Amino acid sequence: AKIPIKAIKTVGKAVGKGLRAINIASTANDVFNFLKPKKRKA
Question: Superkingdom of this entry's organism?
Fold first, then answer.
């Protein structure tokens, strides 16, 4: 049916936001620990 380009783009958008969601979630991890100097106390 008339829905090719929008078909591949639609799926590409899913995997695109899905893979990224895992990325922004992956970067948030290392980062979440990146701002943790040796301080420890307070």
Answer: Eukaryota
